[PDB]
Design an enzyme around this catalytic site. Structure first.
Site, PDB file in Angstrom:
ATOM      1  N   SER B 197       0.899  -1.135   0.000  1.00 27.25           N
ATOM      2  CA  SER B 197       0.000   0.000   0.000  1.00 27.25           C
ATOM      3  C   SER B 197       0.952   1.202   0.000  1.00 27.25           C
ATOM      4  O   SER B 197       1.823   1.277  -0.833  1.00 27.25           O
ATOM      5  CB  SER B 197      -1.008  -0.035   1.211  1.00 27.25           C
ATOM      6  OG  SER B 197      -1.959   1.042   1.148  1.00 27.25           O
ATOM      7  N   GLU B 324      -9.152  -5.400  -3.709  1.00 25.86           N
ATOM      8  CA  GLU B 324      -8.491  -4.303  -3.029  1.00 25.86           C
ATOM      9  C   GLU B 324      -9.504  -3.251  -2.534  1.00 25.86           C
ATOM     10  O   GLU B 324      -9.289  -2.584  -1.516  1.00 25.86           O
ATOM     11  CB  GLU B 324      -7.451  -3.678  -3.989  1.00 25.86           C
ATOM     12  CG  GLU B 324      -6.295  -4.605  -4.406  1.00 25.86           C
ATOM     13  CD  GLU B 324      -5.083  -4.573  -3.466  1.00 25.86           C
ATOM     14  OE1 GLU B 324      -5.128  -3.961  -2.384  1.00 25.86           O
ATOM     15  OE2 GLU B 324      -4.058  -5.181  -3.787  1.00 25.86           O
ATOM     16  N   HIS B 437      -7.321  -5.849   0.842  1.00 23.58           N
ATOM     17  CA  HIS B 437      -6.181  -4.983   0.958  1.00 23.58           C
ATOM     18  C   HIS B 437      -5.471  -5.275   2.268  1.00 23.58           C
ATOM     19  O   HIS B 437      -5.941  -4.969   3.353  1.00 23.58           O
ATOM     20  CB  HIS B 437      -6.665  -3.568   0.840  1.00 23.58           C
ATOM     21  CG  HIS B 437      -5.597  -2.551   0.663  1.00 23.58           C
ATOM     22  ND1 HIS B 437      -4.858  -2.442  -0.495  1.00 23.58           N
ATOM     23  CD2 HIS B 437      -5.221  -1.518   1.456  1.00 23.58           C
ATOM     24  CE1 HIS B 437      -4.041  -1.405  -0.394  1.00 23.58           C
ATOM     25  NE2 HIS B 437      -4.239  -0.832   0.786  1.00 23.58           N
TER      26      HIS B 437
HETATM   27  N1  9A5 Z   1     -11.280   8.245   8.573  1.00 22.38           N
HETATM   28  C1  9A5 Z   1     -12.626   7.689   8.290  1.00 22.38           C
HETATM   29  C2  9A5 Z   1     -13.648   8.727   7.780  1.00 22.38           C
HETATM   30  C3  9A5 Z   1     -13.504  10.151   8.477  1.00 22.38           C
HETATM   31  C4  9A5 Z   1     -13.677  11.282   7.782  1.00 22.38           C
HETATM   32  N2  9A5 Z   1     -13.528  12.314   8.621  1.00 22.38           N
HETATM   33  C5  9A5 Z   1     -13.258  11.853   9.855  1.00 22.38           C
HETATM   34  C6  9A5 Z   1     -13.019  12.518  11.022  1.00 22.38           C
HETATM   35  C7  9A5 Z   1     -12.753  11.825  12.219  1.00 22.38           C
HETATM   36  C8  9A5 Z   1     -12.752  10.425  12.158  1.00 22.38           C
HETATM   37  C9  9A5 Z   1     -12.998   9.783  10.922  1.00 22.38           C
HETATM   38  C10 9A5 Z   1     -13.252  10.491   9.782  1.00 22.38           C
HETATM   39  C11 9A5 Z   1     -12.414   6.489   7.311  1.00 22.38           C
HETATM   40  O1  9A5 Z   1     -13.134   6.271   6.324  1.00 22.38           O
HETATM   41  N3  9A5 Z   1     -11.355   5.717   7.657  1.00 22.38           N
HETATM   42  C12 9A5 Z   1     -10.930   4.549   6.879  1.00 22.38           C
HETATM   43  C13 9A5 Z   1      -9.511   4.168   7.295  1.00 22.38           C
HETATM   44  C14 9A5 Z   1      -9.377   3.485   8.687  1.00 22.38           C
HETATM   45  C15 9A5 Z   1      -7.882   3.042   8.871  1.00 22.38           C
HETATM   46  C16 9A5 Z   1      -7.725   1.521   9.072  1.00 22.38           C
HETATM   47  C17 9A5 Z   1      -6.498   1.133   8.223  1.00 22.38           C
HETATM   48  N4  9A5 Z   1      -6.193  -0.283   8.460  1.00 22.38           N
HETATM   49  C18 9A5 Z   1      -6.109  -1.173   7.442  1.00 22.38           C
HETATM   50  C19 9A5 Z   1      -4.948  -1.240   6.672  1.00 22.38           C
HETATM   51  C20 9A5 Z   1      -4.877  -2.186   5.653  1.00 22.38           C
HETATM   52  N5  9A5 Z   1      -5.947  -2.969   5.432  1.00 22.38           N
HETATM   53  C21 9A5 Z   1      -7.070  -2.893   6.160  1.00 22.38           C
HETATM   54  C22 9A5 Z   1      -8.120  -3.747   5.875  1.00 22.38           C
HETATM   55  C23 9A5 Z   1      -9.293  -3.696   6.617  1.00 22.38           C
HETATM   56 CL1  9A5 Z   1     -10.502  -4.718   6.248  1.00 22.38          CL
HETATM   57  C24 9A5 Z   1      -9.417  -2.818   7.668  1.00 22.38           C
HETATM   58  C25 9A5 Z   1      -8.349  -1.972   7.955  1.00 22.38           C
HETATM   59  C26 9A5 Z   1      -7.181  -2.008   7.198  1.00 22.38           C
HETATM   60  C27 9A5 Z   1      -3.721  -2.384   4.780  1.00 22.38           C
HETATM   61  C28 9A5 Z   1      -2.709  -1.274   4.987  1.00 22.38           C
HETATM   62  C29 9A5 Z   1      -2.511  -0.923   6.437  1.00 22.38           C
HETATM   63  C30 9A5 Z   1      -3.861  -0.398   6.988  1.00 22.38           C
END
Ligand code: 9A5
Ligand SMILES: *[C@@H]1O[C@H](CO)[C@@H](O[C@@H]2O[C@H](CO)[C@@H](O[C@@H]3O[C@H](CO)[C@@H](O)[C@H](O[C@H]4O[C@H](CO)[C@@H](O)[C@H](O)[C@@H]4O)[C@@H]3O)[C@H](O)[C@H]2NC(C)=O)[C@H](O)[C@H]1NC(C)=O
Ligand SMILES: *[C@@H]1O[C@H](CO)[C@@H](O[C@@H]2O[C@H](CO)[C@@H](O[C@@H]3O[C@H](CO)[C@@H](O)[C@H](O[C@H]4O[C@H](CO)[C@@H](O)[C@H](O)[C@@H]4O)[C@@H]3O)[C@H](O)[C@H]2NC(C)=O)[C@H](O)[C@H]1NC(C)=O
Ligand code: 9A5
Ligand SMILES: *[C@@H]1O[C@H](CO[C@@H]2O[C@@H](C)[C@@H](O)[C@@H](O)[C@@H]2O)[C@@H](O)[C@H](O)[C@H]1NC(C)=O
EC number: 3.1.1.7
Lengths: 532, 532
Positions: B197, B324, B437
């Site tokens: 990634s 992905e 992913h």
């Molecule tokens: N940040 C929010 C939306 C948001 C928008 N504004 C905000 C304000 C405050 C808090 C949240 C928000 C959002 O959509 N986040 C998505 C990202 C969360 C980070 C987790 C990263 N961990 C993962 C990672 C990977 N794969 C994952 C697969 C799954 Cl199924 C779950 C997590 C994975 C692979 C690379 C390392 C990170």
């Protein structure tokens, strides 16, 4: 006598013709309009002045002045489409095939020939109405109409060449049938119009035009629809071509009055000789003189008419052949020829595409190419050949027909949809061309019944089965017999969009005929070209 | 002692760690740079001032300040990715796993963590270098780097927050490895960088940047490429966001000097709290602070660099997972949730699309929708779900990776391409998410060898098989053993574009990985948006 008939125009004398171990009556070359000669070239047709005496209708009339295909001199597959009688500007006649004994009030079928609005004949062997007349006990009419510039030179504003006059020829013949077919046993309130290719589009055009709707009851459209991109132009585009035709004959172009006079002075072949040199693009499946959207015959744009339900609400039956594009690729695209498999290089594919979608910019040409190329295998020449066959067929015939059907079906009284995919066993064109533009006609007219022509038994069966669907539909507005114990051609509905394929296999029903490609041609691609 | 090591920065003391019925050495939290605290927040990193005495490297360092996922509190599948140590701005350390007995001059693998340039930790269980170190007798390093605004606030022109500094952290760690890994048995001229990634993209970025090329020998890129649409922005877009971040903390925005001072006064969580509120579009798989194309780290646009061959010519090994997109759809698209099958209405599909392709106009959104909708079956919620999974994966990961590969392969010294499509038997995410992913990582790091974690035998086998390809490739520039009697991972060539899938089945070779879709994302769609 069975063969003498009194009509509102005069007495006519027909002729007894043999058909499959029996006989029937035929009235050939009955005039429905004044010859459109001299100062009347380009004019609206006038009704034929009635005659005293007996009109000899024992032989076929002249075919109209048209371009004549000499690409494969002698070759049956192509000559079968060419005029088989002396051509003349004196050509507005119809032909009537009546059962024996004469019926009182049976179903009428009126055939309108195709040929791109630039050719066609009412008198060709493959349009012989007798097999149908006899097998389904119908009165089968076939009319004729002016093609080419003669039928379609449009100088909107002028009354001397107003345009659309060939569609008016068809209309007059339909008037005549309405007014006289009863004298021949025909029921003027069960007239079905049917047609292939430009004839198909003609039929749909008669469904759209207010001045034609009352003259017939239902319609069959084969491989043509009035909204096809080749089937009509704007009055400006008509004008441009009328003029441009002038220029190629060193004509005076200072007024309509001046040009038309000059064009009327010319011999017919002088017009035919330069007719193709007025197209604005290098193209295929485009034709120089065609119906114009004038605000008279067509009160507004076809698309606005179709959305608003401004058209004859009745039953229709329509469809398409599997490989509509092949004939035009053969005749007009580099790489393709009659005596090879015509595998097609990338480079000739992309030439194909540009020719097939002439009104398109480079972004458009890319969008089309993306849709039709297998990128795993972009140098398979069979795939590029077949992909171009599909592009031409889809863009010109299938997707426009599908768009017509879906619009019609919101407001009409029943729609039946077919996909003809049987390759005839005795076809003389090469295999790659597939199931070709025009080659359902011979099934519709019953030619596989004549032993001498070399159809299989399964093919005779299919022809009978199709002749019956057509005649039964013309009789009742449904191709199915009431309680028959064969499987039912379902109705096409907005919700479910069913259609059947027509071939020698057991009938099979499917849904959403070429919908992936037709969303591209009817929604995406037009949007793409509007934005850019 | 095996665990005392003298380096150019000082003496370090490691720790003996158990691994699969044996033991090895680990040096954890060795500093490679000065803490980037205070007046040095946002700055280029400075080299760590050497220490006298013995640096205690028996325990993991702090993870860098980052956003922390609380979407599924307690859920192993998500917490496994979150920081497992106190976060701090004091976070620039690396970790080294060395075989026992210490080798003299063996292959080195340096892991760079992903997490969208906004999160990541060098210290997570799934990045434990010991299984790899031990099974392939390699020295496995893992570095760390500043994420978020801390790593990537870009005010081009300023030296106080020049941007890219997190990529400079990585570079410094690579410098340190170059300069010191020999003391640990490592061969500094057989350093392979590898990453997933944003780590994958980082690796590719180090291949592109002239100032990083000399610090390593070869590269493995997993599910990331430096040309990914999320992986970098222009200096103007960087500026815009730097500023916009100011505005959300009532900062003085009158000069760079003024803003940065204000931003340096804030606590770390105050920046994390508003970081997502600076994105210009409502979107998924877009990240606020990321590398910038500055003319320093990257001398010109990535695309111009790739066409002209301006990059390190060496061997690379790279590829992608089957699904992905699913993780981002789960977390950021309406309709999708962890505990249902997330079948997706038309209406939520079209919401999906707009989110997935944020930079696109309406014509673009139509082109994407046309490409990915089966129009025979436009209300199948499985198909719409799966189609969106593909849109996100293709647009963000697969097609950009494929574009990188094809450009690299014209000028490089050998490319090996994999498609990982094995769903782990013990996955705790739902089935619809597919092969997700990040979930190849655990195979690469050998976790299916630990009995207690509940992989099948076939999964232990595949992990061993993959660990070997990675280590063998890092050692020789080819993942195949010389004469082994197993089947050979073919080389990827411009002409034939072969790749293998990685799973428990017998190895299978195919060609042209997602080429239909990637011609859409790499050629057609960009053209479409340029014209309009
Ligand atoms: N940040 C929010 C939306 C948001 C928008 N504004 C905000 C304000 C405050 C808090 C949240 C928000 C959002 O959509 N986040 C998505 C990202 C969360 C980070 C987790 C990263 N961990 C993962 C990672 C990977 N794969 C994952 C697969 C799954 Cl199924 C779950 C997590 C994975 C692979 C690379 C390392 C990170
Ligand atoms: C082609 O056109 C013809 C008409 O031009 C059309 O036939 C019509 O079909 C409808 C079917 O709905 C018939 O309408 C019904 O007729 C009955 C019997 O007289 C009435 O009692 C009905 O009203 C009751 O039932 C309805 C439920 O169906 C209720 O909604 C309603 O409140 C009442 O309880 C209703 O009017 C109609 O009689 C025929 N017309 C003729 C002349 O047969 C045919 O369907 C069209 N075909 C296609 C394919 O479009
Ligand atoms: C139904 O099927 C039958 C049987 O398959 C088929 O009969 C064939 O018809 C053609 C008629 O064109 C015959 O071919 C001719 O045969 C003679 C005698 O050997 C030749 O002289 C002919 O050659 C002349 O014409 C050629 C142009 O076609 C020139 O190239 C040449 O220089 C000559 O001038 C010509 O080949 C053929 O022999 C029969 N075959 C049999 C076994 O009877 C019939 O035509 C089919 N019916 C229909 C309507 O299609
Ligand atoms: N006119 C040239 C190009 C040209 C351009 N400029 C010219 C100037 C002079 C002469 C020719 C040209 C051209 O491409 N012609 C293609 C049309 C030839 C008319 C034959 C129409 N007949 C057919 C017709 C049908 N199907 C056919 C199928 C095949 Cl396989 C063959 C012919 C068919 C079905 C409808 C009736 C006509
Ligand atoms: C009607 O005409 C039939 C065929 O007409 C033929 O072509 C015309 C132009 C004349 O040249 C004619 O001599 C040809 O026969 C005749 O067979 C038929 O005898 C005529 N019948 C009547 C009742 O007049």
């Amino acid at each position: 006598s069975e063969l003498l008939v009194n009509t509102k125009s005069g007495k006519v004398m027909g002729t007894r013709v043999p058909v499959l171990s029996s006989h029937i009556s035929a009235f050939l070359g009955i005039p429905f309009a004044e010859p459109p000669v001299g100062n009347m070239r380009f004019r609206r047709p006038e009704p034929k002045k009635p005659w005293s005496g007996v009109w000899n209708a024992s032989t076929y009339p002249n075919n109209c002045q048209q371009y004549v295909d000499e690409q494969f001199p002698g070759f049956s597959g192509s000559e079968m489409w060419n005029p088989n009688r002396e051509m003349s500007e004196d050509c507005l006649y119809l032909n009537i095939w009546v059962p024996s004994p004469r019926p009182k009030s049976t179903t009428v079928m009126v055939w309108i020939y195709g040929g791109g609005f630039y050719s066609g004949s009412s008198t060709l062997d493959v349009y012989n109405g007798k097999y149908l007349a006899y097998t389904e006990e119908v009165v089968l009419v076939s009319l004729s109409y002016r093609v080419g510039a003669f039928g379609f030179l449009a100088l909107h504003g002028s009354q001397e060449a107003p345009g659309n006059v060939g569609l008016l020829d068809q209309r007059m013949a339909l008037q005549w049938v309405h007014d006289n077919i009863q004298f021949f046993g025909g029921d003027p309130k069960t007239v079905t119009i049917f047609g292939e290719s430009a004839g198909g589009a003609s039929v749909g055009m008669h469904i759209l035009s207010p001045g034609s709707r009352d003259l017939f009851r239902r319609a069959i459209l084969q491989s043509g629809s009035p909204n096809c991109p080749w089937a009509s132009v704007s009055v400006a585009e008509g004008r441009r071509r009328a003029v441009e035709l002038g220029r190629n004959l060193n004509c005076n172009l200072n007024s309509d009055e001046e040009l038309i006079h000059c064009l009327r002075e010319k011999k017919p072949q002088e017009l035919i000789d330069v007719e193709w040199n007025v197209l604005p693009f290098d193209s295929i499946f485009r034709f120089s003189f065609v119906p114009v959207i004038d605000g008279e015959f067509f009160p507004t744009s076809l698309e606005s008419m179709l959305n608003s339900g401004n058209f004859k609400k009745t039953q229709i039956l329509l469809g398409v052949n599997k490989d509509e594009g092949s004939f035009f690729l053969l005749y007009g695209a580099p790489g393709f020829s009659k005596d090879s498999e015509s595998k097609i290089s990338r480079e000739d594919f992309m030439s194909g595409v540009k020719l097939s979608v002439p009104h398109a910019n480079d972004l458009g040409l890319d969008a089309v190419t993306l849709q039709y190329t297998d990128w795993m295998d972009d140098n398979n020449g069979i795939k590029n050949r077949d992909g171009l066959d599909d592009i031409v067929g889809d863009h010109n015939v299938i997707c426009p027909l599908m768009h017509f059907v879906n619009k019609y079906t919101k407001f009409g009284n029943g729609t039946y949809l077919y996909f003809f995919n049987h390759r005839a066993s005795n076809l003389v064109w090469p295999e790659w061309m597939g199931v070709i533009h025009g080659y359902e006609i011979e099934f519709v007219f019953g030619l596989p019944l004549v032993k001498e022509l070399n159809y299989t038994a399964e093919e005779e069966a299919l022809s009978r089965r199709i002749m019956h669907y057509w005649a039964t539909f013309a009789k009742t507005g449904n191709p199915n017999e009431p309680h028959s114990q064969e499987s039912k051609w379902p109705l096409f509905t907005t919700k479910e969009q069913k259609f059947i394929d027509l071939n020698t296999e057991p009938m099979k029903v499917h849904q959403r005929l070429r919908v992936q490609m037709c969303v591209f041609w009817n929604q995406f691609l037009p949007k793409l070209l509007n934005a850019t």
